[PDB]
Ligand code: CLA
């Protein structure tokens with residue numbers, strides 16, 4: 001189970017339209033590290049957006065000094081920007097501490113001690129299948145989070161508001177080219 | 179390096195003013211030719227579809243059980259706003275099914291764009307090699323002409339000027 | 344356990360600035376003490392989180408004294424509000440477990456608690472090392488946290504639930 | 509190890525038709541069909557139990573049609589209540605599933621998911637759980653057919669049938 | 679097995695000496711002990727559930743106008759079930775006792791394993807088998823004590839605790 005054959009599954013197989021696998025072989029490790037990192041971050045982001053638009057929110061005040069509740073934070077793109085500056089500073093400080101000490105971003109192979117639910121998959125084919133599942137879900141989540149953000153920007157309403165309004169058909173509505 | 183490989187014609191031969199394939203990468207040329215042929219087939223379907231949709235020809239019956247019929251659907255981009263949402267989803271789902279499962283090479287073809295897969299064939303082996311190349315060139319050039327034609331039709335729908343008598 | 348490097352992780356590895364370790368026996372004694380302290384402090388920290396989150400049982404802790412579970416303080420003085428009979432029962436259970444079921448004389452700290460596939464150590468020794476180090480480090484962090492909680496309640500006079508309010 | 513799979517007590521190798529000897533080459537696809545039907549029937553039986561226990565989502569299945577999740581009939585007529593777009597979405601999703609992700613042409617039924625994400629290393633335990641799956645699928649096929657026939661003949665869903673007390677057919 | 683059930687502080691505890699004498703009956707005696715341990719553990723959990731009033735919402739027997747709440751939480755709860763209900767219980771457990779998980783299988787290994795899997799480590803497997811046996815013994819004693827306490831006091835465990843009648847003095 002080497003890194004070069006991971007992420008090449010059906011139906012596309014080794015899918016490199018740019019041909020960078022054969023002309024830039026030395027940068028593949030860093031590129032796959034970036035791809036896996038983005039995939040994990042985007043999977044977390046997609047789950048977070050699904051949680052937000054379902055109104056699964058904490059009870060209380062995120063910043064009682066600012067008189068701001070968790071429910072006051074928007075469920076769309078502006079939600080992270082609605083957090084107080086001190087809260088954003090704490091979030092980025094903790095995330096940087098994690099990415100520098102606990103899960104060093106310099107660890108390109110992505111093996112941060114833990115495995116899949118804490119277990120190493122001793123079966124080679126099963127290990128490869130689960131790594132490919134991680135990569136494919138990361139790619140799908142990258143596309144999904146990009147689509148969610150772009151759709152929110154274009155429609156001007158969050159995912160929950162868009163779904164409540166019934167704004168699903170891009171053609172019959174009066175907005176945009178269609 | 180890329181002369182006379184089905185893109186060359188007597189008026190102009192290998193015509194790559196941008197030099198997008200002049201490097202000589204066979205995989206990139208195959209991808210570009212696949213895109214060109216796919217666009218050409220879609221456009222040569224779209225040209226006749228648009229032409230007979232604007233001519234007033236409509237599929238007989240009702241497009242939906244609620245009462246709306248094919249005759250009520252207008253011509254051009256306005257048609258998409260009047261197709262039932264279930265009907266639009268069914269159209270997109272059928273096209274996606276074709277893209278994912280049907281319109282692809284699974285058994286390996288002798289060139290790019292051959293989707294026969296040994297399942298559906300009308301006797302392409304009856305043609306000789308020159309006739310096969312002639313048919314491929316006809317398909318490709320019809321695809322290019324139809325691409326530009328459907329582009330013109332979609333442009334002039336938005337313009338006040340119409341190219342149809 | 345010293346040879347396995349248990350408890351020596353990043354950033355500072357084998358960290359004994361005062362030279363307390365002189366042979367294997369003193370390390371075994373100190374590691375047993377540290378592990379018991381870590382387990383107790385982790386339980387204490389989980390208890391403090393539960394208390395200051397307001398998650399309390401419904402009913403009376405001692406109906407004879409009319410003491411509800413909600414009347415117990417969430418601070419360091421909460422346990423001392425438990426009636427002496429209840430404290431005696433708690434001490435009896437703790438003594439029974441720590442003398443018979445999980446005897447404290449077992450300096451190895453291993454009592455056969457295996458979680459099946461969650462401790463697949465016969466084929467994943469890396470899991471064994473990771474879990475031992477995680478247990479020790481969480482115990483150290485919880486010891487520091489419970490010391491800090493006690494210090495906060497002493498210096499401010501108010502429990503963690505109302506110190507953050 | 510597939511020919512001896514699904515052979516359990518008290519029947520052992522039960523083949524009254526003699527098709528294990530008449531058509532030995534058709535057994536692979538017949539077992540694949542049996543396993544697929546068993547899985548589908550197990551899911552269907554769980555679905556019927558969930559429906560008749562009135563475990564339904566809150567809201568509208570299709571707000572445009574003003575169709576609550578609770579408005580869908582519990583019995584065999586519940587599939588009719590789903591609008592055309594919903595059925596089209598189900599068909600598209602399961603076409604994708606059963607042609608790409610878990611192809612129906614794989615007659616071994618092994619799609620890489622294992623049993624709760626794991627591969628059973630012990631051959632006897634794996635065989636035992638495969639036999640459990642097959643026997644449960646057979647029982648679920650019989651049960652779902654019985655539920656459908658009982659609803660059709662009685663004219664009422666399982667919830668209505670139990671609530672009315674019409675259990676004994678005499 | 680012979681070494682199963684041997685645990686500190688008692689070790690091999692055979693006060694009446696039925697291990698060195700008549701050793702051929704040990705297999706069935708251990709099967710009976712394990713069966714009773716499992717049954718008594720289930721019974722103790724059932725009593726705890728009953729007296730905490732975790733009950734199903736509805737009617738146990740609508741024809742008899744009997745609700746799950748009407749079933750006593752003590753030893754009289756099994757007597758409140760209708761005859762048809764008891765017959766259904768007996769039929770289902772005749773199936774689960776003769777066909778599935780036969781009681782004649784004295785080793786107790788019905789293929790379900792421990793939470794669906796086999797314990798690969800022999801030491802861990804032996805330890806958990808000893809845990810099962812000791813918990814079964816504790817639950818046997820506990821269920822007998824609970825029954826005797828309810829019979830003598832005349833009130834269920836919930837009623838016994840709520841009334842404060844804990845000390846029998
Ligand atoms: C003018 C346009 C045009 C031309 C010349 C071609 C030509 C070709 N296509 Mg093609 N195609 C087109 C449009 C066109 N296509 C469109 C619009 C689509 C999208 C629907 C496709 C989708 C498509 C696929 C998916 C595939 C082809 C393939 C082929 C090649 C094999 C032909 C074959 O099987 O032998 C045919 C042999 C015969 C003897 C012909 C039989 C006579 C026909 C069946 C009766 C029609 C007679 C009638 C007078 C014609 C009416 C024309 C009218 C519709 C305009 C051939 C080079 C296949 C390929 O590359 O395989 C090599 C392949 O896999 N095409």
Ligand code: CLA
Pocket residue numbers: 140143144146147148150151154155167168169170269270273
């Ligand atoms: C990762 C997967 C994913 C998924 C499941 C969705 C899902 C959705 N997106 Mg979306 N999106 C994604 C990624 C994704 N997005 C990405 C990566 C982007 C770019 C960053 C976008 C950008 C985007 C925009 C800008 C919009 C959506 C919209 C939508 C919603 C309606 C989609 C629809 O009906 O369009 C159907 C479209 C297709 C199936 C694509 C086919 C396009 C072909 C090539 C041509 C079709 C046009 C053609 C000229 C007409 C042919 C007619 C013929 C079919 C008869 C739906 C919830 C729309 C929405 O919510 O508004 C109501 C909307 O406006 N998305």
Ligand code: KC2
Pocket residue numbers: 404405406407408425426427428429430432433434436844
């Ligand atoms: C350490 C874990 C622990 C266990 C395993 C355990 C088991 C049992 C059993 C079963 C064997 C019985 C039968 C029993 C009975 C009573 N318990 Mg325990 N009990 C534990 C802890 C506490 C604490 C902390 C308190 C407490 C109480 C009471 C009272 C109330 C008397 C009254 O209100 O007069 C009664 C009757 C409270 C109390 O002591 O009141 C002064 C109280 O504070 N218990 N308790």
Ligand code: KC2
Pocket residue numbers: 166168569570571572573590591592593594595597598599601602
């Ligand atoms: C098979 C699994 C499945 C998937 C994976 C899936 C995914 C998505 C996604 C992608 C994230 C969106 C955005 C989406 C949206 C809508 N769905 Mg799905 N859907 C599935 C199944 C069904 C069924 C069975 C029904 C249904 C419906 C609707 C309606 C209501 C329209 C309306 O307001 O009337 C809307 C807007 C109902 C229906 O279409 O009724 C007309 C209904 O019956 N859907 N659906």
